[PDB]
């Protein structure tokens, strides 16, 4: 009730598929179709533009994830299938994991066991990696394309897997024989999974909904509607209270987790339907967020009264 709008506080004037803050919310990184991981200083961006680091890649990038303990390390997944860990100080690749046989859509570094990272691919496998080992530590053969994988924020034993089979597969990595639970409800591929808390999981889908799930009691909680998402990866980011996602109308939407329709939205000639928001990232539990769209424009937005 305290917010009704999103204010633009800074802008960096193609598609960015990932925008992510480092461990201390001091730097953020972008990646996508241009085969370039760019790192920016958040404070500089708000107070001014030039990245402080640029790392060229062989392939287009689908996802980034910063290491939660080695603050200068970042992982990427790319359209070749390769999962790379990078040192943004030296610009060198530290690990190049090459087992996936098709594009990898997602990579996530664990918060609680920071040397562990998980990836998912069109090859229908989930792979768990340790930065001290070259071969994967766990391999989960699934039936359908994997669009997103995410570690539980409280324990590296649990991952949520968003699948093109329309379900979220919630695994205990200590016994991958069967998932702990498979959450049905979305009518299309599950493009994102993100945790609000140890027990609260959100998902996005190209059925134009977000959904909230209780992964302790294995229950559906809430469905969120208002944005348009029938085709693209448009971004999902959550914190303790709010969900934000993109839209194929060139708008960013914000939902409070207790309310099914948006509390606010922001629109970034051509119709709205020609551009889409492609990446979003809250600055932890604050009302500030990073956003990017399919032209490559980046905006810093802040919830306001």
């Amino acid at each position: 009730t305290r917010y009704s709008r999103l204010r633009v506080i800074a802008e960096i004037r193609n598609i960015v598929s990932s925008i992510e803050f480092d461990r201390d919310d001091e730097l953020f990184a972008t990646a996508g179709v241009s085969r370039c991981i760019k790192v920016f200083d958040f404070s500089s961006v708000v107070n001014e533009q030039c990245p402080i680091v640029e790392m060229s890649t062989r392939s287009k990038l689908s996802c980034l994830s910063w290491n939660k303990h080695e603050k200068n390390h970042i992982a990427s997944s790319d359209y070749e299938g390769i999962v790379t860990v990078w040192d943004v100080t030296t610009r060198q690749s530290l690990m190049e994991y090459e087992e996936h046989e098709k594009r990898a859509w997602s990579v996530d570094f664990s918060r609680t066991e920071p040397s562990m990272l998980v990836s998912g691919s069109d090859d229908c496998k989930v792979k768990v990696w340790c930065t001290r080992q070259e071969a994967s530590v766990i391999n989960i053969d699934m039936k359908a394309n994997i669009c997103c994988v995410k570690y539980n924020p409280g324990s590296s034993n649990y991952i949520a897997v968003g699948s093109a089979d329309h379900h979220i597969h919630y695994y205990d990595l200590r016994n991958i024989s069967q998932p702990l639970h498979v959450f049905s409800g979305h009518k299309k591929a599950v493009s994102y999974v993100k945790f609000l808390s140890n027990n609260e999981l959100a998902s996005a889908s190209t059925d134009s909904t977000l959904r909230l799930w209780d992964v302790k009691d294995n229950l559906p909680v809430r469905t969120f509607r208002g944005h348009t998402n029938e085709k693209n990866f448009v971004g999902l980011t959550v914190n303790s209270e709010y969900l934000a996602c993109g839209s194929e109308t060139n708008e960013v939407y914000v939902y409070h987790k207790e309310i099914t329709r948006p509390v606010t939205s922001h629109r970034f000639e051509e119709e709205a339907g020609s551009y889409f928001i492609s990446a979003v990232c809250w600055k932890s539990d604050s009302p500030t967020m990073l956003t990017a769209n399919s032209q490559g424009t980046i905006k810093v937005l802040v919830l306001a009264a």
């Binding site: 299309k188 591929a189 493009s191 085709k231 693209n232």
Partner: peptide, 8 residues
């Protein structure tokens, strides 16, 4: 292609 969610 780029940024398009898969199908089965």
């Amino acid at each position: 292609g780029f940024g398009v969610v898969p199908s089965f």
